[PDB]
Amino acid sequence: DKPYVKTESGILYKDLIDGEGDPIEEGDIVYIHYQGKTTNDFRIIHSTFNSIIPPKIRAGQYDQKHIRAIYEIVIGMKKHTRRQCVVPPHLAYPNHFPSQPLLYEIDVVKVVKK
Amino acid sequence: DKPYVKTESGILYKDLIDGEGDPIEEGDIVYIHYQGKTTNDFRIIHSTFNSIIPPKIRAGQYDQKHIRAIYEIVIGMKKHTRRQCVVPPHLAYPNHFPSQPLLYEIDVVKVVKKDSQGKTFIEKVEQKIDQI
Ligand SMILES: [Cl-]
Ligand SMILES: [Cl-]
Ligand SMILES: [Cl-]
What we know:
Two copies of one chain form a homodimer.
Chain A: E1 5-6, E2 12-17, E3 29-38, E4 44-47, E5 56-58, H1 68-73, E6 82-87, E7 102-112
Antiparallel strand pairs in A: 1-2, 2-6, 3-4, 3-5, 3-7, 6-7
Bound molecules: chloride ion (CL) (3 copies).
The site of one chloride ion has 4 residues of chain A, from loops.
């Protein structure tokens, strides 16, 4: 059973599955799947698992297609890492879930180095 | 007084306060305070001065947390240097302020090139009890 580590940005995270290989760096292309849940009524607000192809991002490069936290938090993950994240509202949906942290679990599927 | 020095990227800067110690190099972790203003009407668009702990960046490594110009212009600054900067749109807000330069003043509060940034106080103590 693992503690959370807190980023400067206010994300709490821990790795539920360590994964293996070289850790993702800023600028890497990363294919991911994830789900996010409310912490007040525990409901799934978003799950990508039903997309054929996993969505891809560039690590550390916010491009408005996912919550801000995800672009940051993939850094340091490896292929098959599963990272559980307690996400503060300013990095998720400050206009839809303004008051509560959201709980995300993110799976890295594939990494293409920059 | 002094002229602006222009970088290749178009940052025009002068040091208002020289600073002390070794110059900042790419990759150094730097705590900075800054404010930026429009030159059309000189209103403040951003100020860090309400943050008791100043934002920190790695010199020369844009991470999208601050305007691009900042990561470049810390290089060669020192602890306590204050640099006044005329910044071109491509390095600031290329959509929001596409048509004017912006005026920034950046102060370097602390440089950590150290990795001497080990743990302190109760954290340090509890860490050591966790080797042994
Ligand atoms: Cl799991
Ligand atoms: Cl929102
Ligand atoms: Cl809420």
